[model samples]
Target chain A: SMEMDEKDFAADSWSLAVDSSFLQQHKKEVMKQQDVIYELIQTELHHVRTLKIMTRLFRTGMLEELHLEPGVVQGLFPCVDELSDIHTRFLSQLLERRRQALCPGSTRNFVIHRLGDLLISQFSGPSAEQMCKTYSEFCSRHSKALKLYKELYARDKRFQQFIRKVTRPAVLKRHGVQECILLVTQRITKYPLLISRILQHSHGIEEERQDLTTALGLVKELLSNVDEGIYQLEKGARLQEIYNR
Target chain B: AIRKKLVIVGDGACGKTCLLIVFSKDQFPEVYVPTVFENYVADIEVDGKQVELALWDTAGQEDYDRLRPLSYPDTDVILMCFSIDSPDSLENIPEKWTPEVKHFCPNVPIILVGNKKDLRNDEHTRRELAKMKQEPVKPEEGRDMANRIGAFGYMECSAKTKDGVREVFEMATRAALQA
Candidate 1:
């Protein structure tokens, strides 16, 4: 129940307060996760939903196998971004669940031991891979954006929180906003790596593989250009704010 | 002989692991595994100088911010890596990361590297993009993180393609020689 509550709150709490205008067409899709919450709010639910949507788009002609549509890939970013903190809190809830389930005589060591084993077994399967991959990408990107933000924050606090609160949450890598611009940069830099890795991992045939790579490259190339457009707008706005000061 | 302490410091996911892997086994793995902690040590040579490098591949899991080596005080060179196309990676060189490293190892030569240049064609486009978006970010500020703290120029390399891979350490060694 706690896990489900986390899911319900994670989406709702932000949705209730965050201006819906930020997401535009994506708002309803973001809020639609309330129906899927389970007692434990297990990451499997979130990851599975994400993988399903990603895989579906790829399979049903929009994505062309390992290649995802531009809009579809963009959609995946926000959904997963919400989960970055939610997944950890989910684990914390599980720890809390264990702490309460212990017998009165149980030592702190015993409680930790019991939960540690359960964690090992719980995470030993497909869930482990998903956790590793999702968190890895999230942290890597977060670190990059944070670096840029930390440097700029001293000069401008509004720009700083603007980044942490709104812009950092976007999928772009670099721009006038540090977060989106960094995402844009990585989307391109990591394209071949993604293509090469997906090629090795996907169960598709050679022709399918080539098509996927080309299609994915097309998405990345387009994303780069679109990012530049957004970057220019933000940069101009940033300069205008500076001039106003 | 006692193991000489070598520290690898870089922004997250700048191909530090790939660089270490290339140095250790002269090979690259297919799947990229983000490092949460330091990998193992690899014995290396630079200009007939045998040294042990504590090649740390930090986990980029977004939550392991505490795993960062704030101050590796008796350390030698700090191999600061930036992905060839990662302008964010480059920004960290003089900002968040470099200061932390210098607090631990003062006077250490910071070796700046642009990794994955094997993707050189991509670099040209990325360079243009980076230039367009390049905001003059803050460099090392304050008394501790002054200009003397390893302000080495950057070399573009690819651990996958093995381009300029060896030269990174060579430059570190050259910097050490001057030290």
Candidate 2:
């Protein structure tokens, strides 16, 4: 499904993988769907982890130690609480589904036969509405956040000091403020491709097939919505740029 | 215009969340500003100065002891709250929240808040408190605690009804600025 880290291959993986024989026995298409489904969780895991690093390591220090402008911080890291809630809830959905799918009498090894329902829930309702708003707002702010970072790094002494401290090699792993914001900027785009793979591979019963179809439609719409937002923002920036002339 | 950071610490479900959320929500419409999915900052103009009051809400529950320092540093002011509906929450102010704030924020000013003011005289809320042979915390008691803790000021608010809500942040804003 995803690259299995050395440590992850051995212990406490949230039981993401099963024996190859079991995998081989299952219908090939289900395995493929499962693989994409597995990718969904993996991406979500990294995305949420990225949010935590930005919030816990950088923002915490910016607020507590550096006392950087609170309003500017918001401009830089908008809707983080919402972003965390959105993906955190979805990740929980995927994990709990895995827990429910555990082969009875087996420990930490589980197989999810169908992922369409989860996708349907995630991509269709108020959840989908929220995802579009937040991801768009976040991606929309990428330039502003980058602008803020460079602005601060250039002139703000307090921020200059904090950035140096936070971006240190050991703790931050090169995920500086700009790097983190850029990483987040790319996460939402992963969904459409990921769901595309899942839908292409899934061999489902009629209801499940319809659900995946519905899910695919919903995610593509979300992607379009965000793209629309970027276009509008770019338009605004260009207008403002010309206005200055 | 100036920006200040304020952190709220209190017992869970003691209206700490309400105080922050409502105060955060209140300013945008008439007083003039904006959002981040939820209101964590209140941009208000006071005494000819606009303030971006960045309100921080803390988990008033566990590891709160050690975890508080991270929440406290550089915070200009504190909103140390307890429920008017819960006598024990009031009691914990001096014993629990104060030492934590004082240890880290040391010189930072605190505005003591007795929240759930709307429930103070409500029959159901009153009945529940009395069933345990206890009574809702009176304003005088909250005031006395504020004085005891050397708080910059004491405030009471019903985040439920928006009663006293604006004044709470106004005072919080002032305390933060002075600090």
Candidate 3:
């Protein structure tokens, strides 16, 4: 019954207010889930900011100014521009939805009904595609970037200070270049868990349930692709370490 | 998993490092950045088998001649590269690289890779080579050198556009797997 009701909301374009009696009765719980999504969106925006700052620092010729060889910096921030474009668009959509939910005379039922479709499309479509691509390149470069960072940190005083300055932002404290890279590599893995949790509370809503199921699969596929890339990157990094020794 | 080492050698500014960087890292250089013994690892699948493709980039400068051989000991394949835009670099392959690689890893498979394929048809590259009373290295010339030196294969790639880059590594992986 839950699955069928959810499907009806999805297929019939039922306004949240008129969508389902279940949604109206569970307004508080639905709003709580909406709040959680809001936080997740904000966190993703912070990640985008961190990526932008790191890319900007490198693009400004800071590495050269610090006398680091170009090869040392290879694959450090692959597809950064494309990644920035994708995340900024996602953040805008999330903000737009939030705005609509809070707009005057907007019913809570409609807002809750719309959240499932929004989450599904965002996680399963272009957003997921971009995230997969960005993370794959980022993961492939992970080992080299971290190795280069350590060498620079240990040998170059100026580079150490520069890294400190760039990673000083409160939102970026735990997301220094290396940390941010690892986080990006692990970000997709978190989606399946989060989506499953949300889905548990979305029973009987067929459309939203089906969308969540697809989103979970998409996120899992992304995670595995990135994990494979990370494995290869680490293999390269280990060999480089032995060669250096 | 199978592990194969590949070493690249040629004259300086001949795109030896560029080829490796592009294949392993997927990033193309915007400027000529001289390499000094960089190593990259790529995990490639050939014939449904995993290969740990170790790519060693050596400085093609004369100053690194003595040091370059250190990368040759376990090489399964050598990508002896030369910029297609520079005829002198190609000429050096027979005169310099062939002798050095032959002396060091004499039996390793050598793939004569003509780098900078995108520039081979460029009007600017044609004029620049013309100023030096030279012309770009032709595909036939590359194949001839590969045959003359007894290299395993002859391939051309442009790291800038990433054209044929994957094939270079795939062929190398196949060569390594066979070896």
Ranking by TM-score: 2, 3, 1
Q: Write the per-residue lDDT of candidate 3 for residues B69-164, one digit (tens) a residue.
A: 434555788888889898888888887779898888878888899999999889998988888889888889989988999998999999889999
Please write out the lDDT profile of model 1 over residues A217-239, one tens digit for every residue.
Answer: 55344333333322111212466
Model 3 segments more than 4 A misplaced: A1-26, A57-67, A105-112, A123-130, A168-172, A229-231, A234-245, B1-179
Where does model 2 exceed 4 Å of error?
A1-16, A169-171, A231-245, B1-179
List, residue by residue over B1-179, the lDDT tens digit for candidate 2: 56577778888757676566667656323311111111144677877778867666664223323223434545788999899989999988998888888887889998998998888789998888878999989889999999999999998888767889898888778877772
TM-score (C-alpha, index-matched) for candidate 1: 0.38
DockQ (C-alpha based) per candidate is 0.03, 0.01, 0.01
Query: For every model shown, what is its TM-score relative to the native structure?
Result: 0.38, 0.51, 0.44
What lDDT is obtained when candidate 2 is compared to the true structure? 0.69
**Could you give the DockQ of candidate 1?**
0.03
Worst 10 contiguous positions by lDDT, candidate 1 chain A: A107-116
Model 3 / residue A66 / CA error / Å: 3.8
List model 2 lDDT by residue over A132-210, tens digit each. 8887677666666666777788998878877777666653543567556655655654565566666676656677677
All candidates: CA RMSD in angstroms? 21.3, 19.8, 20.7
DockQ metric, candidate 3: 0.01
Give the per-residue Cα lDDT of candidate 2 at B62: 34
The residue-by-residue lDDT of candidate 1 on B36-129, one tens digit each, is 2223444567677775454443323222232233224345667766665555666566767777766767777777666776554564655666
CA lDDT, candidate 3, residue B86: 87
